[PDB]
Amino acid sequence: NYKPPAQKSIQEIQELDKDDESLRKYKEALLVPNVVVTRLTLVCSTAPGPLELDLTGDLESFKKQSFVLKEGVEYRIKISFRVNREIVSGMKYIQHTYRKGVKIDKTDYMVGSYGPRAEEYEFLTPMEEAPKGMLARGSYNIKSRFTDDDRTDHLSWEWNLTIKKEW
Amino acid sequence: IRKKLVIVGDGACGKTCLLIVFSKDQFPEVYVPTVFENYVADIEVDGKQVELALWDTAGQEDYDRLRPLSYPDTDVILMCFSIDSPDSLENIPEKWTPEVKHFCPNVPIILVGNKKDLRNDEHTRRELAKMKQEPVKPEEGRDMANRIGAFGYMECSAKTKDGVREVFEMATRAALQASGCLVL
Ligand SMILES: Nc1nc2c(ncn2[C@@H]2O[C@H](COP(=O)(O)OP(=O)(O)O)[C@@H](O)[C@H]2O)c(=O)[nH]1
Ligand SMILES: [Mg+2]
Ligand SMILES: [Mg+2]
Ligand SMILES: [Mg+2]
């Protein structure tokens, strides 16, 4: 039902009501491609080392390796990203989990609208539980994707999760 | 315990005054800014202490692409219209609900009728009557609250301050009761 508004640059935005002090503060409070996805992290209390992907290049090094994870552990996924020039409207995160060729999950979150800024943004998912049991160990293939209201295609990368008895 | 509240709704339905009355306890009669600076009010509800962060917004079409930056990490939304403007109420399901649900899935909405004090104002009734309309009625408000899946429907006047502390007590109760967990 929601219908995205007309594209508007940050300058077109500042030009509007530019003599209104109160709106000037509003815009101040709230404010290479435009959106750059930089890092994927696994936030996990029980993990013996840091679990991170750099996504600023070399996207051809998964599926060669993965994140190892002890079966049954709680964790969140933290994606970092950068907005460089203009507003991204209503950015969405979509995830498809594969096991042995079968799609076992699909999940997607409204991350939101974000203006350009120096420091990267960090988006944290809700808590998830690593699989367990004799039949659920080894590798899961994961297809991560971003999209937004001005774009009907995606930023896509693909990563692996390998579930073990031990860390 | 931090919660974030964002107040949305049509231009001139009384968003800003509501917010100012809540922090200052005085209706502004001299000057009303277009958007009041966000600020942090220390409220207590149901035997519990709450750091409540309040964001006013710009309702205009022109800021449709700007305003949605206020939403990330929002815990409760005050979605207003004015009791003296059945148009402002028609836009609830035509604009504010499609937007708020789009950017804030799973987030409780309190539908808020502003300017109660105009329900029975003489001059007001005439103006509305001159375009074949009357003030909005509580049933029309509550009906809408059900139609859009609002946690509640509250009515208020920031002029007389009746209902103001109760609106935000409800929003705060909504936030404690309640896509993606956190953005930083
Ligand atoms: N009569 C009456 N007028 C109000 C009330 N609240 C706001 N207003 C008036 O309606 C107009 C718009 O208010 P404002 O708070 O600036 O609305 P916003 O643009 O939606 O934030 C102003 O002239 C206010 O004085 C109210 O409770 N009663
Ligand atoms: Mg950035
Ligand atoms: Mg205003
Ligand atoms: Mg304070």
Side-chain angles (χ1 to χ4, degrees), chain B residues 12 15-16 32-36 56-58 60:
Chain B
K15 298 184 298 294
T16 302
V32 190
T34 304
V35 171
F36 188 52
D56 192 358
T57 63
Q60 298 76 40

Side-chain angles (χ1 to χ4, degrees), chain A residues 7 12 25 37 41 45-46 49 60 62 64 72 77 86 98 101 103-104 109 119 121-123 133 140 160:
Chain A
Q7 320 83 42
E12 274 145 62
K25 289 198 270 203
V37 181
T41 298
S45 279
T46 55
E60 289 305 283
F62 279 179
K64 302 168 185 161
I77 286 162
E86 294 287 349
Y98 290 90
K103 181 143 44 174
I104 49 175
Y109 304 102
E119 69 286 18
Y121 288 102
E122 283 183 11
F123 160 66
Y140 293 79
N160 304 301

Side-chain angles (χ1 to χ4, degrees), chain A:
Chain A
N1 203 29
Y2 170 71
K3 302 157 166 26
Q7 320 83 42
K8 185 153 277 150
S9 85
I10 282 180
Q11 149 194 319
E12 274 145 62
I13 281 155
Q14 291 163 353
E15 171 60 26
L16 295 170
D17 309 295
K18 51 156 163 222
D19 289 359
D20 194 314
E21 323 201 33
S22 156
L23 286 166
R24 229 135 61 197
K25 289 198 270 203
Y26 192 49
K27 324 198 172 165
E28 210 177 311
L30 305 178
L31 313 160
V32 186
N34 185 40
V35 182
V36 176
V37 181
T38 43
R39 194 163 304 279
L40 155 54
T41 298
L42 250 54
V43 170
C44 175
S45 279
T46 55
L51 308 148
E52 312 194 331
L53 267 181
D54 185 358
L55 302 152
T56 49
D58 306 335
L59 301 152
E60 289 305 283
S61 83
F62 279 179
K63 317 196 154 163
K64 302 168 185 161
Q65 291 178 340
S66 87
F67 293 128
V68 65
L69 229 49
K70 171 169 180 151
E71 79 189 336
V73 298
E74 297 197 72
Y75 72 89
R76 307 175 176 262
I77 286 162
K78 173 210 265 161
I79 293 148
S80 310
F81 62 92
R82 188 107 52 178
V83 184
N84 286 324
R85 270 143 41 232
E86 294 287 349
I87 284 162
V88 205
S89 170
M91 194 172 77
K92 202 188 239 305
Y93 174 65
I94 311 140
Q95 215 179 278
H96 311 257
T97 299
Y98 290 90
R99 173 69 169 178
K100 275 222 178 78
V102 169
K103 181 143 44 174
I104 49 175
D105 177 63
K106 200 221 154 167
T107 303
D108 66 315
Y109 304 102
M110 169 50 71
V111 181
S113 305
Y114 302 97
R117 83 181 186 190
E119 69 286 18
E120 56 193 323
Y121 288 102
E122 283 183 11
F123 160 66
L124 281 102
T125 68
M127 198 84 73
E128 297 252 305
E129 207 199 312
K132 44 168 153 139
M134 154 198 96
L135 307 158
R137 301 192 191 105
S139 269
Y140 293 79
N141 315 126
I142 296 151
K143 295 186 183 294
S144 286
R145 313 203 293 168
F146 270 111
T147 191
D148 63 52
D149 296 330
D150 311 298
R151 182 176 180 171
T152 60
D153 64 4
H154 305 81
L155 272 48
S156 287
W157 65 102
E158 294 178 3
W159 52 286
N160 304 301
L161 211 56
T162 304
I163 307 305
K164 276 204 273 295
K165 292 177 182 182
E166 300 298 356
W167 282 106

Side-chain angles (χ1 to χ4, degrees), chain B residues 105-143:
Chain B
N106 288 337
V107 173
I109 290 150
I110 312 304
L111 182 71
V112 178
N114 284 326
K115 317 197 190 184
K116 261 161 78 95
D117 65 80
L118 304 180
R119 174 126 53 213
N120 286 297
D121 180 69
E122 294 161 3
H123 173 261
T124 302
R125 286 190 169 275
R126 172 160 19 216
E127 300 295 332
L128 291 176
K130 198 161 76 267
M131 60 207 181
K132 307 173 50 135
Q133 276 172 334
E134 49 179 64
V136 182
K137 282 131 49 196
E139 305 138 286
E140 285 178 299
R142 206 184 313 111
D143 189 351

